[PDB]
Amino acid sequence: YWELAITTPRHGDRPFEIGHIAHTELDVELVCSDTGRNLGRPWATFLVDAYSRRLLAVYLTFDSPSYRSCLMVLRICVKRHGRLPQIVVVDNGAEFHSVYFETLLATFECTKKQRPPAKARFGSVCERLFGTSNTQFVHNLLGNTQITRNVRQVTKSVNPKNLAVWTLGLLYEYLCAWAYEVYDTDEHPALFQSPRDAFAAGMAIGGSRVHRMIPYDENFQILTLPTTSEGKAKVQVGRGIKINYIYYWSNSFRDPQIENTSVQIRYDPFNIGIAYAFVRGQWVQCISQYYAELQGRSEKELKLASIELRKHYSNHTQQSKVSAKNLAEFLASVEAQEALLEQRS
Amino acid sequence: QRFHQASPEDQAEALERYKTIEPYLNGHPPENETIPARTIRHWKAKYLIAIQKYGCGYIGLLSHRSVKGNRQRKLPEDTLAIMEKFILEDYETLKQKRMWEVHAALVRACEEAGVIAPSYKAFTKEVQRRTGYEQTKKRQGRRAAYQHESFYWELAITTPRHGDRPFEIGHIAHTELDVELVCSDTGRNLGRPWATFLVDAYSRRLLAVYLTFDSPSYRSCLMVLRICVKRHGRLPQIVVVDNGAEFHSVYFETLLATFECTKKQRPPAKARFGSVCERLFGTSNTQFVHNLLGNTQITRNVRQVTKSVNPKNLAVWTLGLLYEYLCAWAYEVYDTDEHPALFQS
Amino acid sequence: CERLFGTSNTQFVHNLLGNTQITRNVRQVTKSVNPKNLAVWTLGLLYEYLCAWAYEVYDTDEHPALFQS
Amino acid sequence: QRFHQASPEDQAEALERYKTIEPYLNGHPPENETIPARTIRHWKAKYLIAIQKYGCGYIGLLSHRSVKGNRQRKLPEDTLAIMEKFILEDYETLKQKRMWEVHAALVRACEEAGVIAPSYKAFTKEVQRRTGYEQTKKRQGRRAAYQHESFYWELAITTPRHGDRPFEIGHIAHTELDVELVCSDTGRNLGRPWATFLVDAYSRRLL
DNA sequence: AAAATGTGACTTTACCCATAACTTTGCCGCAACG
DNA sequence: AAAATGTGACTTTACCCATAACTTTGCCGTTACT
């Protein structure tokens, strides 16, 4: 499309005006920080300023993209800046539709513009950003899943499953260093400067706008939490509510009429020692079994541990096939021997 | 706090209010609005008041539907007191009276007292609101209320419950395998054998497995400890045993003293203190024991046992083969099987 | 006939001390709840009250299958 | 028979179609009709077709949703046959094996035979299709399967089950009363007394 | 005379995916009236 | 060598009547603007 007249800019006239949210699956393998077993490949969420091509915030998770994978990048952006873009643009579908994302946006007077069905030309800048990220950082990492594009050529000598040594924390540090220091200072060919310099100039022209300042307190943290697919849970006796195979407990569950009742839940994906439930018309904190084991730890590693444990639980749920196979082999010879011993008698 | 008092559907309704108001707060009202003028005016006025007082207008749009509702009791207070007394002194008793008879007695007492009698639904609803430790202990006893026990949830991090390292906390437990065993020479019914387990509570690993027909005594502990020393080389640092008389003896205590073994004693009728090995007994039952001829599963309800399905006439296994296959299970199948709370075998 | 046993359980027998009701769950029995230490009834009085129930309590009670006592 | 093939939801939908078409059948069509013209015309045409070649035209407005669906089995036939055989010969057996172990054995056999292995949910769902008397008798025994045995439902007037008059059919049965008794004099426990009941089947009166 | 051990293998709802099967409904022609 | 007995007492939903504690509306008074 060609812009004959001078309409509203597609990139913006000042920073933070349009924040494009996009997602990519890294061509890399990640192992546990305590065992070394290959978890898999992660998902990164990039929030890029359309005006300055600056990566304001990033989010790392092992899950497929959805509203929880962008509320996280929004809260990270608020953590590092304290303001939200007035036009936070997200994707269409059902994984990006919820009732807490839009409530968060309506709290701070923000506007949401979803993509049209199967048309990403509005966020076409994110496509080149993903290409640059893959061809500048991702493909330059040991054990990158570059040969996985040709499954027929994936030999055990060059298999990234037994090659990559990258971990969630170390690769997170490397990704942040590449995105916020190398990319943020490297000149972009679009506007002909570095993203940081363009952002500084745009903020100088547009001021600070202190009315959009948000205090990064605990209330905001609860304001930016996702919810499981069902949205409710059953209160078991003495145990609590199950979220991602973890039982979160609150003393409010001791009420006789709340037992085994369906209660609305919310889960923090940056720490798994704390969730929230709705009891007696009040949101109440629920403590898991990972709270004592992670009491006294800063928030800069709680999220790493939580994501790693989530992926570990998913892989354990996947291990049931091998468990059943071994049980079947053992039981087969039990039967064999049993039949032989009966025939002997 | 006002926000945190609301519910998810309150969030949705306040969001609907916000999307109704926002076009009016942008100078571009819609040409087709279902909401009338007065309602949108009220919502806009509340938005303005909230944005002019609390610094955030969305809080004005909250409904807080939990605050509305008739939380007042409808029965007279004398009836409530008399029904509470009857529940306390005629239903929570060591008689297990049915609800109908105690309700009838309550109604007769009410009719003598001249107070308004309640309905059977009222009695059932107030009995299901007093459920818990008190009811189960004043009805069936302490061993039945033990299922309705409050768990222990760690706020701070004491010494870990299952172990900081292997061979730190190890559990001893006996049981009788639900399988009828036959003799290897004369082929008569030898009854059900007894299996004793020594489990490393950290990795839940079966350190030692022993099987013998005799009732548990110091001989079983002797054999299990000798097996544990033979297979690995060292006894567990803290041996956790139950209050059985075979552990409160003179041989076991001096045996543990000789090898610098801290002996821990779980309180009587509190099996949760051995939640690792005891659950592993059920794992053995479902994975190896209950898949064998003569599995005394039907005998749980002896009313359904027939001479054709009595396991005694079906018994085929001997002691040696059952022990050797249970050892094969313990040291290879459960050994290599991945664990939930361990993320590896 | 057989269900008339169960009614005798609910209306007369399970509402007495020392009833053998909690022994269905043998795994949950303690010396403080054993009916052999709580029992106080005798054969004569138990028979007398069972006859009373069967002859003037259940006898005058309306039946669902007859719409009459 | 078409009416007998209808559901209450299908009946309500037919009622809605009739209420939509009724103004068009009286010369007073409404000026506010949300339903498009093509559907109204099709409903009217089928109304006339039914009133012509059936006898009543309402019966031409029946949906019969029950026929719709994909009942074709999605698993390969060899997979079926193997899983039938394993459910027959490794689950309903005098072992009371759990479903996970039998599914694992079936999966191992399928991988030996080079066929598709059904998921665990499929195994549980088909096992749930075999419930009743046969499975309970082939797993627990004839005593346990007796609950789901059968009810003999009277078609004609045979001799009544519970007699015709008092003192016609009386049942005799004994039981062990669930009550402990102490000795009258010495106070020692004596056990649980036995109760013998003779009761007529007509008036239920404990004889 | 006295505080601190639930647990994990197995099974079951729930959401998505593909296809069969009846009903909708805009896009076009065709007969009838002004 | 073989027909042809499930009950019913004691619970648990499920719907209706009453009232609290607010949202949801119309309607009229008031006021800025033309």
Ligand SMILES: [Mg+2]
């Ligand atoms: Mg034991």
Ligand SMILES: [Mg+2]
């Ligand atoms: Mg047992």
Ligand SMILES: [Mg+2]
């Ligand atoms: Mg009895």
